[PDB]
Amino acid sequence: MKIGIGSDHGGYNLKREIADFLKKRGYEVIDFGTHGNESVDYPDFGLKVAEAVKSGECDRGIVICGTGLGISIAANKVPGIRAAVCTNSYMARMSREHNDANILALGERVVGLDLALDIVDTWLKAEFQGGRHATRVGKIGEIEKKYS
Amino acid sequence: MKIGIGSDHGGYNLKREIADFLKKRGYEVIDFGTHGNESVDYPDFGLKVAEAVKSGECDRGIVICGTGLGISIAANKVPGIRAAVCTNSYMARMSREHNDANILALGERVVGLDLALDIVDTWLKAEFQGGRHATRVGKIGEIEKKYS
Numbered sequence: 001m002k003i004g005i006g007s008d009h010g011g012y013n014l015k016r017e018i019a020d021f022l023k024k025r026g027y028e029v030i031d032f033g034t035h036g037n038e039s040v041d042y043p044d045f046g047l048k049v050a051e052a053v054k055s056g057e058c059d060r061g062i063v064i065c066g067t068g069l070g071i072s073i074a075a076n077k078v079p080g081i082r083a084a085v086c087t088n089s090y091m092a093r094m095s096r097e098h099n100d101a102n103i104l105a106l107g108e109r110v111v112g113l114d115l116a117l118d119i120v121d122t123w124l125k126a127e128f129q130g131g132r133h134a135t136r137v138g139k140i141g142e143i144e145k146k147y148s
Numbered sequence: 149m150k151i152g153i154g155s156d157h158g159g160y161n162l163k164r165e166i167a168d169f170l171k172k173r174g175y176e177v178i179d180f181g182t183h184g185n186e187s188v189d190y191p192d193f194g195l196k197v198a199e200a201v202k203s204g205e206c207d208r209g210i211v212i213c214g215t216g217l218g219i220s221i222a223a224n225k226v227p228g229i230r231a232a233v234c235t236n237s238y239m240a241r242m243s244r245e246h247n248d249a250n251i252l253a254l255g256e257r258v259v260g261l262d263l264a265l266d267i268v269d270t271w272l273k274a275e276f277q278g279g280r281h282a283t284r285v286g287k288i289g290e291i292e293k294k295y296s
């Protein structure tokens with residue numbers, strides 16, 4: 001599958017590691033930037049990844065900033081996007097199983113590298129469980145329709 | 149300040165503990181439910197808290213589900229809402245300082261009680277730092293205006 005990835009300067013180094021991780025595993029990676037350590041604004045890169053996932057240009061996306069919070073909040077503003085900030089593999093599994101998340105958000109200043117690779121591996125392998133969880137994802141779509 | 153609180157059945161027991169906690173500290177708490185352990189849909193309660201914060205009926209809100217993820221994704225679909233799933237006090241502090249979060253999301257199946265009270269104590273005390281962080285919050289507002 002095609003994984004879009006994006007970060008601010010706060011998640012740039014962890015993004016470099018995950019892009020490498022994913023390519024080694026034979027995923028196609030689209031890197032939406034940022035492309036160095038200079039200060040940039042996490043909403044710009046959250047948006048590029050979220051719109052790539054929404055357009056079907058990427059199948060899913062991973063967004064990284066210092067904590068994961070800002071970039072995931074920004075990505076969740078896009079209708080049809082469910083971005084999950086995960087700090088352990090349990091949350092990552094559940095974000096796929098229950099929330100059908102199509103963006104994984106991570107925080108480079110919170111999770112160390114090997115932990116974050118473990119979360120990514122879990123998230124990429126977990127599967128949506130449907131049922132009552134589809135009903136709940138629909139109700140998330142209803143909120144989007146209300147404020148649309 | 150007036151704190152709105154809400155959960156599904158997955159965050160109901162932790163909600164009870166936090167409501168008690170906040171009252172002992174002299175916060176006015178508005179409990180949006182749910183009001184027992186029967187299975188319910190986290191988007192309904194994320195929405196109620198988010199709309200209370202948005203109307204000014206509550207100053208800030210706390211939403212709880214099994215992981216915090218579904219309920220905070222739902223809350224983040226409301227314009228003007230910035231809901232932060234935090235699993236430690238550092239993320240809670242940053243969600244205020246940097247993201248000016250007006251909703252704290254927690255996961256009852258992820259954080260134990262005393263940890264979760266520590267995160268809430270931190271979040272309620274932390275202050276927005278403005279500056280470049282206000283510029284970035286504005287860009288989240290721009291995504292909202294785009295998809296409005």
Ligand SMILES: O=C[C@H](O)[C@H](O)[C@H](O)COP(=O)(O)O
Nearest residue numbers: 010065066067069070071246
């Ligand atoms: O959620 C926002 C992210 O954590 C950022 O990477 C962080 O706010 C940027 O902080 P600073 O401007 O001090 O690098």
Ligand SMILES: O=C[C@H](O)[C@H](O)[C@H](O)COP(=O)(O)O
Nearest residue numbers: 098158213214215217218219
């Ligand atoms: O993010 C969704 C929350 O984790 C819920 O509390 C959880 O999905 C509900 O799971 P179940 O229906 O098995 O109680």
